[PDB]
Amino acid sequence: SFEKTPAIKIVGNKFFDSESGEQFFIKGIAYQLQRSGAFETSYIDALADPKICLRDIPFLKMLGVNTLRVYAIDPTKSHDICMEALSAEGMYVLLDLSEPDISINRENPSWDVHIFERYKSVIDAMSSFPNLLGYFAGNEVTNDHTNTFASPFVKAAIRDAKEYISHSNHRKIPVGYSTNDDAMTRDNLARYFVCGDVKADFYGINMYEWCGYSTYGTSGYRERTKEFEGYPIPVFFSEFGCNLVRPRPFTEVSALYGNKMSSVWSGGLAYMYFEEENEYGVVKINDNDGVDILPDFKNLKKEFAKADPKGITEEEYLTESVECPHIAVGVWEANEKLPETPDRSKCACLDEILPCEIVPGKYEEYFSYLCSKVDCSDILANGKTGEYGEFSDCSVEQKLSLQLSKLYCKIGANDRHCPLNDKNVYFNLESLQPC
Template identity: 50%
Template sequence: ISTIDIVGNKFFYNDTGEQFFLKGIAYQRSRREGEDFDRSKEVPYIDSLANITTCLRDLPLLVELGVNVIRVYQIDPNADHDICMNALASKGIYVLADMAESEMSIVRNNPNWDTTLYTRYTSVVDALHKYNNLLGLIAGNEVTNTKYNTDASPFVRAAIRDVRKYIKNSGYRKIPLGYASNDDPEIRKSLSNYFVCEDPATRCSTADFFGLNTYEWCGYSTYATSGYRDLTIEYSKFPVPIFFSEFGCNAVSPRPFTEVEALYGSTMAKVWSGGIVYEYFQEVNNYGVVKENDDGSVAKLEDFEFLKQRYNSVIPQGITAAEESAREIPKLNCSGQNDIWKANTSLPLIPSSGKCDCIYESFKCTANPANLDNDLLKEICSNIDCSEISANGTTGVYGPYSDCSLQQKLSYVLNKQYIEGGNKTELCDYDGK
């Protein structure tokens, strides 16, 4: 299967130069409530690309839907993905994968980019880079989702910067890296500008693509009334490929998916590179197109037939890579901070495990790995100066040890408090923590 390249603000097949449009679906089963699993041996999430029985069972249904991309939200880097990835490739299906996981991600209300997350993200790269049908990797999903947490975005740009450098230094192919945003009109324009704008100091951290999770079109809406027209005008000169990383409002059920005709029609296809329907598996939020039965089989829901009809009836008309190369795509300058958008273009440090391990080994008082707690860190920092381990995405000020792991940062402040308090045992014991 051919790799997918980015030229200008569009995707193209590497071998033919034909434009590639995403006809995708989110493919991520959640663990059922009360489902038993051994946390000492299993990850707390389900890796959809490592479950051979499930992915081979579902492959004919994905083909029937007319899907050419699946989005998976959590990957176990230690699992074997060969069978599922190769089976998908044999049917022309690509994979868009998030690098975070449920318990290891950039948290919007307490963001950081540290050695633990760096190891997680780069391990996903190591696990998936060899597959030609890896379309791209997502560094963050709706991390900043309101005007009150825009300071989290610099940490995602730092992740893109460092993963890109890791890919290059590892000799891997140039894997596209991007971001998936929610659709908040108050911050949408500033947020998308932030991830693709050219800033001399942070040029290597720009996203290769941008996804928008949008649920504006419900039922039998229209191009104008849904807001799709306004979105298309807003992003008509966007410098990188943009697509709907999630779509499929379920206010009307079953979903008729009438937006598919507009999304892949002549007007929107000039701007948008398609989209990804949310989602394949029926969960409690009622967005699925199939329901998994207790015996392991699946039953098609009404949404399945509607989506199948829509996806298989549209053939978007694109251009060639050569034609796109001849076009001039304007770069975007960074719009800067304002009363609503407070993210700084100064980015967090590149995580350095060598530095962090070195300082950790010098401590006389260290945190118990079984009691790592951000609340405890905040409690201690209310009593002493913690600027050395602090990171602020609004001011762009990052302490020299802000890139260290939670255990190392907690140990840093415990050790500092212990020394400043005269090496008193109770200051290190901290109620057994």
């Protein structure tokens, strides 16, 4: 049963409960364990472990939240026990598709079969749950004026995740983006993610401008609210909770759900549940695996309890592409033109037919070496100029194998000797069998 969590849908720039027709406001907290790793994943998936999630849900209920943000799940594990238990308390999940070792690399961005496969894996693991509120296609990928060229890759990922869901049998869970709050980039980022032919479904900002006993006017919240007025998709704080002043009073919550902000914003999620030596938690897990409540907890609880946002109904609400920011060197360098959808079968053909292959700092050395001997244009991807090589969507190993093979063919010995000395290099006997 998921009767306490009917699926949430989007209409215009608001979220609505698909049964009641009432506007849905997010009252959230981030929920993610870390470690500080071959046989285990780098990330920990608390939603795959009933002993963890079932400990914490009663405390989450006490806080009064209706949403969690989860940054990483292991798609190979089951999640129904934890998802059902969250549903029984009226709780929804916002979920990042990426994970620390499979994300769009903001300093060398690609949108490729390896990252797309991760995204699909997550979608297929999690889309059966009606309380899955939405997916994030990226978190703070572009984060300042020196890496704006990563943003076309994120937009391609939004497009392709949405299309994969569209063509699947799943409920059409919306796909959005979570951004940081860098002054030089924020307006251009927000416009970029709703410009042209591909749009985010919703937009989360990780918002830390309000610290201590601040006010609507002095925090920056009034000016942010003014700038997002009329933005065409739902907008919310995907993180909040500046810890400059402790214990956090969380008085920003009174502003966020007040009349002035509730007409623009769809709520927000505090960062975060667990205390991890970063002074950001509201509970600390002791050496006996019990929950010890920290001084922030009561303050967040009290603020969420008093929050009573006045929205509008789906029926009363119901009664031209936006231009992409222009390019200026050192300010904004995200091309409107996006990379193509990664093509697993084209790329899988390299695995089959190439004479010389490599099994997955060697990449830098090897690309530098091979790309002085053959033309690597076919694997380059440039988000500034909107020029994406024919094989730029393949995995890094496939890309290196392609270049190695070109060098092998260029030499022309035909003696099965691949021209790079490394234990990971091998001649592919399938290349001999008569893509």
